[PDB]
Amino acid sequence: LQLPWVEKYRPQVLSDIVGNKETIDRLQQIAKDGNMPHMIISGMPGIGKTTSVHCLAHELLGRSYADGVLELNASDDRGIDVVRNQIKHFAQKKLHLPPGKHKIVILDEADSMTAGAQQALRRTMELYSNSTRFAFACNQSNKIIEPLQSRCAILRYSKLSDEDVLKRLLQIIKLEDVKYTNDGLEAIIFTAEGDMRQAINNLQSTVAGHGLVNADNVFKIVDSPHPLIVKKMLLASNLEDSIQILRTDLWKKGYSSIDIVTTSFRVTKNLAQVKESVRLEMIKEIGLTHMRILEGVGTYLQLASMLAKIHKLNNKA
Amino acid sequence: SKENLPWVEKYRPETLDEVYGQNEVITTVRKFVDEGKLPHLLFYGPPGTGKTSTIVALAREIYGKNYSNMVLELNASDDRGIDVVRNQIKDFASTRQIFSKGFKLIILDEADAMTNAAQNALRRVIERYTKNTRFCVLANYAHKLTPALLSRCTRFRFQPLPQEAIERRIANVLVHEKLKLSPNAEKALIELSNGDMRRVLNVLQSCKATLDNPDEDEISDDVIYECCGAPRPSDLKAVLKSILEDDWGTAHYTLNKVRSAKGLALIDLIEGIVKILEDYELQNEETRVHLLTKLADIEYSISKGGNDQIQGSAVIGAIKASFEN
Amino acid sequence: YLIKDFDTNGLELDRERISFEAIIKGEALHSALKDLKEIGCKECYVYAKTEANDENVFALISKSQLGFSKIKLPSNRSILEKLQVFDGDSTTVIDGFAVIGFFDFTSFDKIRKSTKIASKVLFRMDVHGVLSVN
Amino acid sequence: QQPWVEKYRPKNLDEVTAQDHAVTVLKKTLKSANLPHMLFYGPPGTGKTSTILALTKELYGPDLMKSRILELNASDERGISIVREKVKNFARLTVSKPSKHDLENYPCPPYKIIILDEADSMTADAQSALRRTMETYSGVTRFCLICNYVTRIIDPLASRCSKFRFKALDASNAIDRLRFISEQENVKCDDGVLERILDISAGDLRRGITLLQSASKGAQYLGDGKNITSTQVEELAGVVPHDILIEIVEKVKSGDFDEIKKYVNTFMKSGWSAASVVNQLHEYYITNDNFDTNFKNQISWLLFTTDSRLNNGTNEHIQLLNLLVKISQL
Amino acid sequence: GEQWYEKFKPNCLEQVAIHKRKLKDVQEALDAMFLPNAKHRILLLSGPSGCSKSTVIKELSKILVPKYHKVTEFRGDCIVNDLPQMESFSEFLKGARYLVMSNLSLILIEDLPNVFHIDTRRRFQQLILQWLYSSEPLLPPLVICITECEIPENDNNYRKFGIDYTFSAETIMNKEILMHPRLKRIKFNPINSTLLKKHLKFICVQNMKMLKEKNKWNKRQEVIDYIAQETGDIRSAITTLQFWATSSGSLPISTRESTISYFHAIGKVIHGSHSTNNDNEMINNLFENSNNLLSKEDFKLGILENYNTFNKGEFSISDASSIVDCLSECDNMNGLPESNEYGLREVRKTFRNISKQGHNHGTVYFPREWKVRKLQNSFKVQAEDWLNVSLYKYNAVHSFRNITLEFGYYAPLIRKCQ
Amino acid sequence: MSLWVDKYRPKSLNALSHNEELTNFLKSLSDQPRDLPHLLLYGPNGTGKKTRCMALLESIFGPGVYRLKIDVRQFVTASNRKLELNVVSSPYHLEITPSDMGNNDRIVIQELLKEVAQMERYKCVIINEANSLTKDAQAALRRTMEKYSKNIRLIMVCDSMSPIIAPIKSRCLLIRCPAPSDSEISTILSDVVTNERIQLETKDILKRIAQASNGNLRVSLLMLESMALNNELALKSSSPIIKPDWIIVIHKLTRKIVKERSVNSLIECRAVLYDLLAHCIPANIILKELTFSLLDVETLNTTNKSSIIEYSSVFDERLSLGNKAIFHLEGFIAKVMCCLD
DNA sequence: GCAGACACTA
DNA sequence: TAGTGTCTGCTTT
Ligand SMILES: Nc1ncnc2c1ncn2[C@@H]1O[C@H](COP(=O)(O)OP(=O)(O)OP(O)(O)=S)[C@@H](O)[C@H]1O
Ligand SMILES: Nc1ncnc2c1ncn2[C@@H]1O[C@H](COP(=O)(O)OP(=O)(O)OP(O)(O)=S)[C@@H](O)[C@H]1O
Ligand SMILES: Nc1ncnc2c1ncn2[C@@H]1O[C@H](COP(=O)(O)OP(=O)(O)OP(O)(O)=S)[C@@H](O)[C@H]1O
Ligand SMILES: Nc1ncnc2c1ncn2[C@@H]1O[C@H](COP(=O)(O)OP(=O)(O)OP(O)(O)=S)[C@@H](O)[C@H]1O
Ligand SMILES: Nc1ncnc2c1ncn2[C@@H]1O[C@H](COP(=O)(O)OP(=O)(O)O)[C@@H](O)[C@H]1O
Ligand SMILES: [Mg+2]
Ligand SMILES: [Mg+2]
Ligand SMILES: [Mg+2]
Ligand SMILES: [Mg+2]
């Protein structure tokens, strides 16, 4: 029964959590003071939001959090009536809490919860904010309605830098006592793209499939991310080079055409070097190829035509 | 159980060693199960690679007699809504062992069709109940999957089947049923496979019925090309040569004669021409742009329907005009 | 429907490692299950404990939005025929030991009507955690 | 009695005339029980429905039509839930029990066949749901997909189902069949009427059969006892006369917009279908050897564009006027 | 401890964050409602969150009820034992109806019942309509506060009709209650920069001992003015100020980043954003901000109708033709996110190219498609009546196309002479 | 009664004043009704294809074809949305009303064709304007006429049959109904004015009506009706040929586009287009009429006309797939202004 | 975002 | 007194 590294090596205190020094320091300060108001935590997945909330609740309450709170996550019936009733009962049932401590309502993955439940939560806060406090763990703050965010201090988690992920990887390697190579670690960081959970999964797979962590083994088990390949494809000068890159990196690797079109659209949205006219022309061509793919024609000829038209509009004769 | 099923579901692998092509994935999964750790395997690739066959063989090898009870199979055939993932998956991935302390495997085949709320509930399930139950996700389109799910699942890429895997499977099929196949037909099947085992098995099943005598004879290029209907490479080369040197009259006559001699399709001719023209050296890139754009437009029009003669003359005119640069 | 009948199956158990056994009347258990359903109690607990003074303890307690519910089944021999707790060998009876079972409410709701018309109900579970109800 | 399309519909596998490969594969399957999932595709009116009906008749028989055959079409609701539940219910039924007469007479396979016509117009979600039902339940059931649009069927379905292309029914592919029909129905042709009918027809035999029936009815009504000529089938087929096409070409040759527009209006007020006019103009322009390569390529591209526009459900008058104006200005 | 916005609640009418005109025209509105005969039976308040839409009425009831603090605020989280939520609001209205004398308790429905199911949404309209035309002596005041916030996009919404797109008074309320004679709609605006700055001054000087403990007394002015200018919500401003004051330092504070409006987005696409000079980042941020509005019909029509107001229709005709052609080409992509991006990008690029001749602009108009549909329905029912009356004495089959094209003018002309 | 469209309608098959080739062809078809296959009619609007269908039904069935039999049927789509259709009934045949929306068109066709079929002579179904279907109803008709081709006959009349899918065109016999020449329309009008003995000094007005309606029987008859009732049943050679508000509005819009080419002119064109489109009309015929009126301007040269017709074809293609119509209409108008300026 | 009209002291 | 700050629009079966 070997527990996976994502769950076995998850942090239990806020000290082990790295990536945003200011936010962790703020969480430690607000736990030491104990005056924790409502907050919303948002960011790209795999950065350490829900584990940070759990660790904060742990080292803020202890036995009280362990025994006498009601934590709800996405794996429950999040209907309006049942959630209303559950949070209404949880707002009651006060204990001999310390004067600087309050109940915490952990809300994990609240982006998919219905608007009526948000209104019921609004009423619950406006009626019993004195006894309990709410904590929100989500990906983006747009899915939360406007009135909820006015009663809370929104905290944003930035993407983890390479230094913090590398430090965590070295700590986990020292804990596991496994050989490593600097090239392999650099490849792991490059493949992760700031995703801590993906980096942990890749390192665990490398360790359990090849032993020593090396760049060659990592590249063998997992290839380069497709956004980088598509970005290099769109920035290619010659059409033949772009066609060869497309074929040898997506057609021979087993990549669906619709996924390639979606990645091209995402890259073109976030591209910055191209001009506005070139960007909109590329977006139009990507959309035309996407509707052609959706209507049924899912062959490589459509991708080749998209690349040819993109090169033609880039060169402009 | 055998000799009563289609060839696709007749040579389905039952063990891990019977899966060919993705040797690295098989070795990595074997190391994972030898160490005793399943890191929420996620399989991605084109259809026909063998993701579900591999995962079913792996589950059989791990479990044995516990496949009936502890292994759960999920698909798009049954209802997969918010209530289904909320109740059935939660109830199944909450139980203890019965005879062996092995992990719990849940097969999410073609899981790309699930709703966003269902995907979010599923990923909150995988995060919470990971200490005893490990899920497996199978999909062909990664754009339909929530990016949070990909972070929590170890992604494994299923490459198209290489030439050696197709040749080994062809040899295994031939030995089992005592069938002889010519090396030219083998090369034709390698070219036509395009990294698909199901297509190879389907065309091999039909070529057996094409021959009047199942035994005491071989399968040549003519039988393979007549069975599926793919154009011969010689026919494609002759059509391209006629287009290149003859402008419209004898070129159109040759194209019509080739198409009417056997019943060739415009589409298959289009992939034949693009395949034999991809290796051409054209240092202007305007010919390449024009050829790609016009051929894609013609293929789209054929997919939408139209006149066969009109589309064939359109192909001829596009090829002639593009090469004029 | 006999196409993909996987056969075998069976949530059976071995009698060599039975944690404890209990025999109770159907009427006594039906009242407990009926009260357990309408109140809610999405998570339920099974407690088994023997006493040297023959004061055996067995109850179906649960937690819900109401709080803590303690449906204490009777301990006398009038409607509780037999109750002993084993040490994982099904032959070595031990007194003072407690067996705690964490069961879902959905499983309990299925046997509520089964015990509505019954004479004797037999409870048996092992160390593996599976429960057999006769 | 019955129209010749349905009266002369094939009932046996050997009654076909052009699709040799699929029919002989099914015939060699008749002595076995390893029939795979089939994907029938090709031009309209090539007999895919006739082929599957004949195969079913050879396999099961009229007694087993009502017990081992399920057909789902566009005539009823084809939603995701209804199709899902119906396919799951029928693809789970046990093997039927044939009588001793059925086993003695016909070779009864141990499986059942599910036929899904016009599968092109089926949503992708339904096909995704049906993928696993086709795959893991295929022990004693099979699925047949018939559709004239290959691209409308997604990639996973094209892999599980064996691809059986149906050849376009050209002239020599159906000359014998039309000759047999003419002898059976007592239809007289002088030199090349049947060949002309297949030339007019777009690679199908049903339209040709309907045209032959109309010509025979007209000849019977006329009652003079003469044979059908090519002019009669050309007139009843909507074929533009050669003189009018020559006039169209001559007016296009002259570089005047007003006369061209007036003649286009006069041609369109006759209500003639623009597709036939486009095809006749295209074949005349390619057949003519008085034009160079660049003009031929340009006019072929414009004709292809106009054909796509017309097939996309646009106005015939505007499209034909634009095509003739573009041709005149080359 | 205690929230700053809760411990610093206003106690008089001079501490609430509201404009003088808004205070005046809610005071005159509420004063006339307390009379036995009132022109407006109920009061409707619509505006953004945190705009003093409820506290102002709270002290207003505090200083008007004792003339003849009695507030009957509806609690939607009540269940009421074995009572459906649909009938709960019906019982609340009749329970608070019997307060016309002696008690005189004002009704403040801040938390309206959730209206998302078909049955419960339709019930909400006639429940207040039955209370309007009821011929009963006297009248207790009733104030309904509705927050204007758009509901975020969800999955598998099927037809994707109204209400669920944006939770606003116009979407849920029907036409009968919107322009009812016995109803006043007093809109609300976000808190001004001056009022927010004054309130933050008051909070800072009230918390002088806490702020002077750390190194925040010198830095407070920049933080508070940035907070006041960044958002118009007083509650969010107080929350951010409390978080910053509790914070030791070196922490970048965050704000809700409230979504922009429909006409605001239209102006952003046509004119441009001064905050973001770069064109690429403006559209990309707007997409992730409100995709729920861009991936919706009538927005492209709004761009089509308001693009001639850039220079009062005095710009390049070729540029206008290119813009309209690009929108028409976008319309063929079956309403995809890629389709919306290309057309808006082209419009913004063109208007940036011709931005030099943009000194004077015009007003934008939301497209009149509802009127076109209404006249279409009227013509449809008129044609149905014409076919019904013309088929009872003879036979006439010409399909619907010939009636609209040929018989739409010839047929009335012939009957005019006869 | 009210109009010449329905009053002096040709009852018998032998009372047709148009060309006799089509009449002889349909008489040959109607000689053996048992062997008659599914039929499809294509031609210009107003030619009278429904008259040929009624004459064929008279030849096959006999007297009693024209029966009112107004019936109302209720149909239920997915979820919950009641639909109403005032379908017309008749003994031995039934006519389909295509007035329902294209999206929810499968339910009505499927239910009513199953109701006419049942299991059981045959009952014929007439389906006018079959081009409005979104190919789903077309597939439904295809399957219905394939599977149940023992007791059902489909006779569909339509104009510009290009949107009709290829499989349907293969399974149905093609009937061509060309519009009559000016001589036949003049003869019909002369027969009408002789029947009612109205005043007529010069026959040039009859030729003017015949040539001004573009070979349309209904349009010519209604134009004759409008001027006859407005002139006390006394036609005059000096009486101008009047046109509906449709043609006047189209010509005024064309003149405004040709004269004024500006963004203000564009928004007034938008207002005119919205006022036109507020009457439940398809935009394809509006685009065709605008293109034909633009090509009739004498001041334009061949290059402007070629550009106008090319962009008209392009925007008609765009309108073919587009959900809206105002976008493509304004695009075509703006392109025309750009070319003219 | 922008046009039209008002509050308020610099 | 001319600038700077800010309310109303600009919206439906
Ligand atoms: N700063 C960190 N230091 C160490 N491990 C981390 C850190 N951030 C994330 N992890 C690891 O990430 C895994 C799960 O993190 P999560 O908090 O669940 O991801 P997330 O950022 O919350 O994204 P979502 O929305 O939950 S999918 C665990 O294995 C953690 O150990
Ligand atoms: N590597 C392989 N070696 C041998 N046979 C294979 C291999 N991959 C696929 N096959 C055969 O292909 C058949 C169909 O492939 P499956 O594994 O069932 O489906 P899949 O390849 O995973 O594609 P999807 O995603 O399910 S559509 C199997 O039953 C095998 O007979
Ligand atoms: N090989 C053939 N020999 C003789 N008649 C044939 C043959 N193929 C087709 N037919 C004729 O074609 C008609 C049957 O064709 P269908 O099967 O209905 O058309 P289809 O194949 O279904 O085309 P679809 O479904 O519209 S794509 C009958 O009139 C047959 O006589
Ligand atoms: N000077 C002030 N003026 C107004 N509100 C203040 C002030 N000082 C503190 N507050 C608080 O700010 C909040 C504003 O409340 P309101 O905006 O009236 O409520 P609301 O408008 O109903 O909010 P929603 O949209 O319903 S969640 C209350 O919690 C007040 O106690
Ligand atoms: N052979 C004919 N002789 C005289 N009038 C005819 C003839 N055929 C049709 N019509 C006229 O056509 C009118 C009906 O046209 P209609 O069937 O509505 O055209 P469409 O079928 O194109 O809609 C009738 O009023 C009738 O007077
Ligand atoms: Mg989380
Ligand atoms: Mg699979
Ligand atoms: Mg068919
Ligand atoms: Mg409030």
DSSP helix/strand/coil, B70: coil
**Chain H nucleotides covered by protein, CB below 7 Å:** 5-13
Contact E340, E294 (CB under 8 A): yes
Q: What is the CA radius of gyration of chain C?
A: 16
DSSP helix/strand/coil, F88: strand
**B-chain residues within 8 Å CB-CB of A296?**
303
* Closest residue by Cα to residue A288 from E281, B302, B300, D310: B300
Query: Which amino acid makes up residue E296?
Result: K
Contact D118, F139 (CB under 8 A): yes
DSSP helix/strand/coil, E147: strand
Task: Check whether residue E235 has its CB closer than 7 Å to nucleic acid strand G.
Answer: no
- The stretches of E331-368 forming alpha helices (DSSP H) are 337-353
Q: Is B5 in the pocket of ligand 1 (CB under 6 A)?
A: no
A263 with A287, same domain: the answer is yes
Query: Which amino acid makes up residue A103?
Result: K
- The residue whose CA lies nearest the C1' of nucleotide H11 is E366
Q: Torsions phi, psi of F88, nearest 5?
A: -90, 140
- The stretches of chain A forming alpha helices (DSSP H) are 5-8, 21-33, 50-61, 63-68, 80-91, 115-128, 146-150, 162-176, 182-192, 196-210, 215-221, 226-234, 239-246, 257-270, 276-295, 300-315
Could you tell me the residue range of the domain that residue A101 belongs to?
1-160
| Sign, CA torsion B194/B196/B199/B205 | positive
| Sign, CA torsion F261/F262/F267/F268 | negative
C-alpha–C-alpha distance, residues A34 and A56, integer Å: 11
C-alpha–C-alpha distance, residues B48 and B138, integer Å: 13
Q: Which residues contact F290 (CB under 8 A, 6 or more apart)?
A: F250, F253, F254, F312, F332, F333
Q: How far is CA D296 from the centre of its chain?
A: 30
C-alpha–C-alpha distance, residues F316 and F322, integer Å: 10
A9 with A131, same domain: the answer is yes
Contact D281, D248 (CB under 8 A): yes
Q: Torsions phi, psi of B104, nearest 5?
A: -100, 125
Distance F41 CA to ligand 5 centre (A): 14
Q: Residue C9 and residue B69: Cβ atoms within 8 Å?
A: yes
Q: Is B162 in the pocket of ligand 2 (CB under 6 A)?
A: no
A23 with A138, same domain: the answer is yes
* Interface residues 1-30 of E with strand H (CB < 7 Å): 19, 21-22, 25
Q: Residue A152 and residue E243: Cβ atoms within 8 Å?
A: no
C-alpha–C-alpha distance, residues F106 and F87, integer Å: 15
Pull the structure tokens for residue B14: 């039952």
Is D188 touching C (CB cutoff 8 A)? no
Question: Which residues share a beta bridge with E184?
Answer: E43
Assess if CATH 3.40.50.300 describes domain F20-176: yes
A59 with A110, same domain: the answer is yes
The DSSP 8-state label assigned to residue D228 in this structure reads B
A13 with A148, same domain: the answer is yes
Question: Which residues share a beta bridge with A132?
Answer: A103
| Sign, CA torsion B280/B284/B285/B286 | negative
Order the strands of the B41-44 sheet from edge to edge.
B72-74, B104-108, B133-139, B41-44, B154-157
C-alpha–C-alpha distance, residues E408 and E415, integer Å: 12
- The residue whose CA lies nearest the C1' of nucleotide H12 is E370
Task: Check whether residue E349 has its CB closer than 7 Å to nucleic acid strand H.
Answer: no
| Sign, CA torsion D300/D301/D305/D311 | positive
Contact F206, F186 (CB under 8 A): yes
Task: Check whether residue E365 has its CB closer than 7 Å to nucleic acid strand H.
Answer: yes
CATH number of the domain located at residue range(s) F245-340 in this protein: 1.20.272.10
Q: How many CB atoms lie within 10 A of CB E417?
A: 11
Query: Which amino acid makes up residue A240?
Result: E
Task: Check whether residue E122 has its CB closer than 7 Å to nucleic acid strand H.
Answer: no
Q: Which residues contact D231 (CB under 8 A, 6 or more apart)?
A: none
Q: Strand D38-41 to strand C57-63: parallel, antiparallel, or no bridges (unpaired)?
A: unpaired
- Residue whose Cα lies nearest atom 9 of ligand 5: it is F48
> Residue E149 CA to H5 C1' — how many Å?
26
CA distances to A85, A267, C104 from C40, rounded to whole Å, are: 13, 51, 12
**Chain G nucleotides covered by protein, CB below 7 Å:** 1-3, 7-8
The DSSP 8-state label assigned to residue A159 in this structure reads P
- Residue whose Cα lies nearest atom 6 of ligand 4: it is E9
Q: Torsions phi, psi of E334, nearest 5?
A: 60, 30
Q: First vs last Cα of chain F: how many Å apart?
A: 52
| Experiment used for this model | cryo-EM
> Residue E189 CA to G5 C1' — how many Å?
17
CB pairs under 8 A between D and F: 167
Q: How many CB atoms lie within 10 A of CB E39?
A: 12
C-alpha–C-alpha distance, residues E402 and F9, integer Å: 17
A237 with A212, same domain: the answer is no
Q: Do chains C and F touch (3 or more CB pairs under 8 A)?
A: no
Domains contained in chain A, number: 3
- The stretches of chain B forming alpha helices (DSSP H) are 23-35, 51-63, 82-92, 116-128, 147-152, 163-177, 183-193, 197-210, 221-228, 233-245, 249-262, 266-277, 286-304, 308-322
Q: Do chains C and D touch (3 or more CB pairs under 8 A)?
A: yes
Tell me the angle at which helices B51-63 and B23-35 cross, rounded to the nearest 10 degrees. 30
* Furthest C-alpha separation in chain E: 96
Pull the structure tokens for residue A220: 């063998």
Tell me the angle at which helices D193-200 and D171-185 cross, rounded to the nearest 10 degrees. 130
CA distances to B17, B56, C4, D3 from B14, rounded to whole Å, are: 9, 8, 17, 54
Q: Which residues contact E108 (CB under 8 A, 6 or more apart)?
A: E54, E57, E58, E61, E71, E72, E73, E74, E143, E145
Residue D219 is inside which H or E element, if any?
helix D206-222
Q: Torsions phi, psi of D71, nearest 5?
A: -120, 125
C-alpha–C-alpha distance, residues B83 and A77, integer Å: 8
DSSP helix/strand/coil, C80: strand
**F-chain residues within 8 Å CB-CB of E401?**
129, 282
Residue with tokens 């605008």: F290
Q: Strand D141-146 to strand C131-133: parallel, antiparallel, or no bridges (unpaired)?
A: unpaired
- The residue whose CA lies nearest the C1' of nucleotide H4 is E194
Would you kindly state where each structural domain of chain D is located, as residue ranges?
1-169, 170-239, 240-330
Contact C100, C131 (CB under 8 A): no
C-alpha–C-alpha distance, residues D226 and D221, integer Å: 12
Q: Torsions phi, psi of E54, nearest 5?
A: -120, -40
Is B98 touching C (CB cutoff 8 A)? yes
Question: Which residues share a beta bridge with F39?
Answer: F155, F173
Q: Residue B68 and residue C129: Cβ atoms within 8 Å?
A: no
Task: Check whether residue E401 has its CB closer than 7 Å to nucleic acid strand G.
Answer: no
Domain boundary among A192, A224, A256: A224
* Furthest C-alpha separation in chain F: 67
Q: How many CB atoms lie within 10 A of CB E51?
A: 26
* Closest residue by Cα to residue B227 from E322, D25, A276, E194: D25
Pull the structure tokens for residue F195: 């029947």
